[PDB]
Write an enzyme that holds these catalytic residues in place. Sequence first.
Site, PDB file in Angstrom:
ATOM      1  N   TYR A  32      -3.985   4.075   9.319  1.00 16.30           N
ATOM      2  CA  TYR A  32      -5.176   3.721   8.870  1.00 16.30           C
ATOM      3  C   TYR A  32      -6.375   4.245   9.545  1.00 16.30           C
ATOM      4  O   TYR A  32      -7.587   3.659   9.744  1.00 16.30           O
ATOM      5  CB  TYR A  32      -5.249   2.193   8.887  1.00 16.30           C
ATOM      6  N   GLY A  33      -5.975   5.216  10.444  1.00 17.95           N
ATOM      7  CA  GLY A  33      -7.099   5.783  11.459  1.00 17.95           C
ATOM      8  C   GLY A  33      -6.864   5.166  12.970  1.00 17.95           C
ATOM      9  O   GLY A  33      -5.664   4.659  13.224  1.00 17.95           O
ATOM     10  N   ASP A 165     -10.391   0.437   0.103  1.00 13.38           N
ATOM     11  CA  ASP A 165     -10.092   1.735  -0.175  1.00 13.38           C
ATOM     12  C   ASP A 165     -10.032   2.498   1.083  1.00 13.38           C
ATOM     13  O   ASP A 165     -10.933   2.682   2.023  1.00 13.38           O
ATOM     14  CB  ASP A 165     -11.412   2.385  -0.833  1.00 13.38           C
TER      15      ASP A 165
HETATM   16  C1  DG7 Z   1     -16.264   7.065   2.797  1.00 11.47           C
HETATM   17  C2  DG7 Z   1     -15.834   5.602   2.071  1.00 11.47           C
HETATM   18  C3  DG7 Z   1     -16.775   5.000   1.417  1.00 11.47           C
HETATM   19  C4  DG7 Z   1     -16.332   3.910   0.912  1.00 11.47           C
HETATM   20  C5  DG7 Z   1     -15.076   3.344   0.900  1.00 11.47           C
HETATM   21  N1  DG7 Z   1     -14.688   2.147   0.425  1.00 11.47           N
HETATM   22  N2  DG7 Z   1     -14.920   1.857  -0.671  1.00 11.47           N
HETATM   23  C6  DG7 Z   1     -14.584   0.502  -0.973  1.00 11.47           C
HETATM   24  C7  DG7 Z   1     -14.747  -0.409  -2.232  1.00 11.47           C
HETATM   25  C8  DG7 Z   1     -15.215   0.720  -3.294  1.00 11.47           C
HETATM   26  C9  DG7 Z   1     -15.488  -1.273  -1.800  1.00 11.47           C
HETATM   27  C10 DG7 Z   1     -13.098  -0.839  -2.792  1.00 11.47           C
HETATM   28  C11 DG7 Z   1     -14.061   0.127   0.279  1.00 11.47           C
HETATM   29  C12 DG7 Z   1     -14.197   0.910   1.041  1.00 11.47           C
HETATM   30  N3  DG7 Z   1     -13.795   1.332   2.556  1.00 11.47           N
HETATM   31  C13 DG7 Z   1     -12.751   0.433   3.062  1.00 11.47           C
HETATM   32  O1  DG7 Z   1     -12.014  -0.394   2.288  1.00 11.47           O
HETATM   33  N4  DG7 Z   1     -12.565   0.560   4.308  1.00 11.47           N
HETATM   34  C14 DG7 Z   1     -11.681  -0.143   4.954  1.00 11.47           C
HETATM   35  N5  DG7 Z   1     -11.747  -0.166   6.535  1.00 11.47           N
HETATM   36  C15 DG7 Z   1     -10.925  -0.798   6.985  1.00 11.47           C
HETATM   37  C16 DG7 Z   1     -10.580  -1.157   8.345  1.00 11.47           C
HETATM   38  C17 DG7 Z   1      -9.178  -0.459   8.765  1.00 11.47           C
HETATM   39  O2  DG7 Z   1      -8.171  -1.242   8.276  1.00 11.47           O
HETATM   40  C18 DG7 Z   1      -7.847  -2.319   8.953  1.00 11.47           C
HETATM   41  C19 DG7 Z   1      -6.540  -2.873   8.883  1.00 11.47           C
HETATM   42  C20 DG7 Z   1      -5.524  -2.152   8.858  1.00 11.47           C
HETATM   43  C21 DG7 Z   1      -4.212  -2.779   8.773  1.00 11.47           C
HETATM   44  C22 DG7 Z   1      -4.192  -4.195   8.751  1.00 11.47           C
HETATM   45  N6  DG7 Z   1      -5.141  -5.011   8.925  1.00 11.47           N
HETATM   46  C23 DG7 Z   1      -6.534  -4.293   8.654  1.00 11.47           C
HETATM   47  C24 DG7 Z   1     -10.383  -1.903   6.106  1.00 11.47           C
HETATM   48  S1  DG7 Z   1     -10.751  -1.627   4.579  1.00 11.47           S
HETATM   49  C25 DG7 Z   1     -14.269   4.220   1.728  1.00 11.47           C
HETATM   50  C26 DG7 Z   1     -14.574   5.291   2.169  1.00 11.47           C
END
Ligand code: DG7
Length: 337
Positions: A32-33, A165
């Site tokens: 997940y990075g 995502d």
């Molecule tokens: C460049 C780009 C732009 C927009 C997106 N988008 N577009 C969307 C939607 C379109 C809104 C769906 C959602 C994302 N992004 C997104 O979800 N990012 C996340 N980051 C984390 C933090 C790390 O995991 C934590 C963790 C790990 C394991 C357990 N528990 C917690 C979670 S969800 C993506 C990439």
Amino acid sequence: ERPTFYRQELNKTIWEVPERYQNLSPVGSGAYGSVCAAFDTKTGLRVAVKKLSRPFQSIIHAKRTYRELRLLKHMKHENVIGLLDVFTPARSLEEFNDVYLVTHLMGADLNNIVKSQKLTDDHVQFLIYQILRGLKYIHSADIIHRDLKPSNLAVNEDSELKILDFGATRWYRAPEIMLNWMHYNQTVDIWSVGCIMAELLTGRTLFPGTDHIDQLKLILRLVGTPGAELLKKISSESARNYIQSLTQMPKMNFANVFIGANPLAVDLLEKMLVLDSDKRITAAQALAHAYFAQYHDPDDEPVADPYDQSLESRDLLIDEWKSLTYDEVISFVPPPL
Ligand SMILES: Cc1ccc(-n2nc(C(C)(C)C)cc2NC(=O)Nc2nc(CCOCc3cccnc3)cs2)cc1
Ligand SMILES: CCCCCCCCO[C@@H]1O[C@H](CO)[C@@H](O)[C@H](O)[C@H]1O
């Protein structure tokens, strides 16, 4: 007041977080990075803290950082990932180099719920309802997910679901994405939902293609070759000629593919897995479908405020993206607990 930060060595780097975030430990191995599980003492929640890797190393990185932060800040829906916090240790723009994102700690994705096993019909109803409720919201902001699949779906113990995502991997993709079509409808996401639903009902992948062409072969076996109305819509001469050269196979009987399934589930699947994207049911229409009678509530299926995708698609200098990202960090307001 600015919070008190503490420093600590984690994932080969020195992390610097507010002291409210306690007991950091790496999760996911690295899939997940650079992410640590933490306990948020302020809220009493288990959280995940992500240290963005090289957020401002290049224009592309800086642009991605800004796009994700701005988007996550905009998402405020029960079935979509939300941001709990975002912070930097930096006290000014000059020393701004790191960005940390904070979300809920998630214990499971949809595959961890399914375990290649059939779910009950009531459970399928509940999970698909939530995906569609989240999709209605996302689509109303004029956003297309494009990579909806079980690993992008967080699900807690009471089966509450959130769409995210994280950025085989082709099993849930709409055929027009597989063909590099380029004018994607929001209903590419509905295709993915049909694939997810079919798997929940049967406990097996609907289209487990071995490679790119096999994936398309499997799809056509179920939904048939393109009819005349669809053939009319193909601008590509080569695509047109090739499909014309194919042997016409009729659509299969979904009732005889999902044996013993709720007939309402079969009906919905028929409306999702249509080759012609213009003919697929929308997220809003799907919510009103009888399959979801026990969950559907027209007064609690909210839409998003409009979202400006042009701002992230600009051609800006590295320090401009950085300053704009810094503004987004500073202006952040946490959700009501
Ligand atoms: C460049 C780009 C732009 C927009 C997106 N988008 N577009 C969307 C939607 C379109 C809104 C769906 C959602 C994302 N992004 C997104 O979800 N990012 C996340 N980051 C984390 C933090 C790390 O995991 C934590 C963790 C790990 C394991 C357990 N528990 C917690 C979670 S969800 C993506 C990439
Ligand atoms: C041989 C496999 C054929 C797959 C054809 C998939 C057709 C998808 O459907 C198409 O989606 C396009 C992109 O949104 C739209 O512009 C078209 O109007 C729509 O017909």
